[PDB]
Amino acid sequence: TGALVEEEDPFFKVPVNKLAAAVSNFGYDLYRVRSSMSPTTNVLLSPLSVATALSALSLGADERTESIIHRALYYDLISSPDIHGTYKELLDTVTAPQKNLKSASRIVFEKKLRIKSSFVAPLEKSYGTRPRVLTGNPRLDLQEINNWVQAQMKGKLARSTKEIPDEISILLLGVAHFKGQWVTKFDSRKTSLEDFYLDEERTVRVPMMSDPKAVLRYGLDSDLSCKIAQLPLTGSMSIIFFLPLKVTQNLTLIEESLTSEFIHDIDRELKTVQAVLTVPKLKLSYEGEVTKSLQEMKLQSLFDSPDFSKITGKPIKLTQVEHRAGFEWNEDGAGTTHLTFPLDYHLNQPFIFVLRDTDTGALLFIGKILDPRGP
Numbered sequence: 376t377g378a379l380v381e382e383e384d385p386f387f388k389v390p391v392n393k394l395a396a397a398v399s400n401f402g403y404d405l406y407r408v409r410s411s412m413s414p415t416t417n418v419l420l421s422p423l424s425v426a427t428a429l430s431a432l433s434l435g436a437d438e439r440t441e442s443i444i445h446r447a448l449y450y451d452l453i454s455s456p457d458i459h460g461t462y463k464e465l466l467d468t469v470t471a472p473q474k475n476l477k478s479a480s481r482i483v484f485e486k487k488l489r490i491k492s493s494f495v496a497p498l499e500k501s502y503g504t505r506p507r508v509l510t511g512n513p514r515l516d517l518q519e520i521n522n523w524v525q526a527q528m529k530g531k532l533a534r535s536t537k538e539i540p541d542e543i544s545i546l547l548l549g550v551a552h553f554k555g556q557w558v559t560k561f562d563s564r565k566t567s568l569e570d571f572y573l574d575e576e577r578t579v580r581v582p583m584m585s586d587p588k589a590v591l592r593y594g595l596d597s598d599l600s601c602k603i604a605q606l607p608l609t610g611s612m613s614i615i616f617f618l619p620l621k622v623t624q625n626l627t628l629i630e631e632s633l634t635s636e637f638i639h640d641i642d643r644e645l646k647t648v649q650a651v652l653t654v655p656k657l658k659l660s661y662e663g664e665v666t667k668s669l670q671e672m673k674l675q676s677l678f679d680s681p682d683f684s685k686i687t688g689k690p691i692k693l694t695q696v697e698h699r700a701g702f703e704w705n706e707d708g709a710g711t712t713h714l715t716f717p718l719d720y721h722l723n724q725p726f727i728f729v730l731r732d733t734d735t736g737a738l739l740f741i742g743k744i745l746d747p748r749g750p
């Protein structure tokens with residue numbers, strides 16, 4: 376509907392979960408915009424790091440500009456204050472050691488700019504991050520950033536070398552990395568090269584992990600025309616696979632459904648079954664700019680002439696938003712485990728997976744896998 380009312384599903388009535396649903400819904404919008412731009416390539420995305428940079432920035436923004444941002448983050452549908460106080464919490468929860476997610480955001484400003492401490496104060500408190508002011512020296516500024524996303528990602532992300540843009544006003548950076556563990560490991564001796572249908576005309580061989588007697592939560596959505604399965608990870612997390620029925624690169628109907636609320640129903644409507652599971656080994660990375668995506672996400676106003684007078688007196692505008700993500704999984708797990716039910720779940724064709732946090736329900740990672748072999 377779109378109007379302000381009180382929450383019903385007890386899950387979203389919790390403030391931190393409510394905030395996670397908004398930020399996550401922003402993630403889904405971004406994914407949909409980006410998937411539309413990359414019709415033939417894998418899409419790896421960890422929206423949280425980017426959503427956090429926007430929300431942090433919105434601190435030194437004024438009414439009109441702030442709203443533009445708040446509306447893209449679904450905050451205007453949250454009838455609760457201390458939205459930043461809650462964000463501090465959410466972050467504390469999903470970045471905890473037990474999870475295996477490392478997510479960081481950074482606001483970078485143009486050379487010689489002077490930032491009002493009234494802005495730095497709220498920012499460092501709620502988001503635990505200080506703004507970096509560019510040096511002007513191209514080689515020195517790029518070193519700084521790389522060392523930053525290095526100390527942050529504990530050196531699990533490829534040190535970039537794209538050379539910061541000549542023209543920079545405000546730069547937002549969102550980096551994230553993930554290497555987790557299933558509650559049940561896979562037999563490394565059961566992993567073999569198998570056929571992966573890239574599409575109806577092309578096939579390739581990628582190493583596939585296997586478990587002929589896997590216990591996962593399953594469900595078939597007749598409308599979307601796909602098979603949904605959920606595998607748990609240690610640290611109270613899960614991965615949801617959306618496997619279409621026929622081989623295809625067209626996953627639109629499905630993508631169009633991805634929302635926080637939709638995922639909550641699927642999570643509960645799922646039934647535990649036993650299945651023959653084969654999932655490809657995955658090790659992916661992505662380093663790009665999502666500025667063009669945000670531009671057609673009702674966020675153009677920020678690249679034009681926004682009002683950030685709460686940050687500085689000089690007119691500054693959102694110039695670029697960069698994202699660096701690294702995702703990976705394999706056999707590593709925690710431990711192991713009349714009349715049955717048949718069930719095949721073979722991920723040997725284009726699919727979409729969603730790494731979600733079980734406690735808050737926050738979207739930690741999303742990917743459209745057209746080719747396991749990676750970029």
Ligand SMILES: *[C@@H]1O[C@H](CO)[C@@H](O)[C@H](O)[C@H]1NC(C)=O
Pocket residue numbers: 625626627628
């Ligand atoms: C994707 O498949 C659906 C269902 O067959 C179809 O309606 C849609 O047109 C396809 N995507 C296109 C045509 O861009």
